[PDB]
């Protein structure tokens, strides 16, 4: 699965880790995170994230 | 997937659109919406909805 | 699916029933419950639960 980065604050969503404190378990692809989730650091929505392409 | 309507207020849940502001992504069948979700307009529970049959 | 028990208060999570008032539908395996869910009786996290083995 791909990593996504918040373009406002640089936080990286890593699908291996998830975001368990906000209900997003390990192994969750970014597209499957509920659409009301926000960046843990900056508080902005999913629409300010983009794929980390290698 | 089928559309469901709130029988209290007439809101239509359309699975193609979801209800993304409340965490229900596009493509979510009504049976899979978490059971604590409520109608966005009237605030009533899933048990007041019924299938829109054609 | 296996039942899990809260080791703090003895609550039993039964996957057939779920915990629908807190958004966990019937048929949800414990591993798939969002990781910010807490025991309905004692308020403690998933890390204080263990499998009920028969
Ligand atoms: Fe951010
Ligand atoms: Fe309604
Ligand atoms: Fe408990």
From Swiss-Prot, chains A, B, C:
Gene Ontology biological process terms from the UniProt entry: alkane catabolic process
Similarity comment: Belongs to the rubredoxin family.
Species of the source: Clostridium pasteurianum
SUPFAM superfamilies the record matches: Rubredoxin-like
Domain Rubredoxin-like: 1-54
Domain of life: Bacteria
Designated name of the protein: Rubredoxin
Cofactor(s) demanded: Fe(3+)
Role, per record: Rubredoxin is a small nonheme, iron protein lacking acid-labile sulfide. Its single Fe, chelated to 4 Cys, functions as an electron acceptor and may also stabilize the conformation of the molecule.
Positions that bind Fe cation: 6, 9, 39, 42
Keywords recorded for this protein, A-Z: Electron transport, Formylation, Iron, Metal-binding, Transport
UniProt GO MF annotations: electron transfer activity; iron ion binding
Modification N-formylmethionine, positions: 1
Cofactor binding summary note: Binds 1 Fe(3+) ion per subunit.
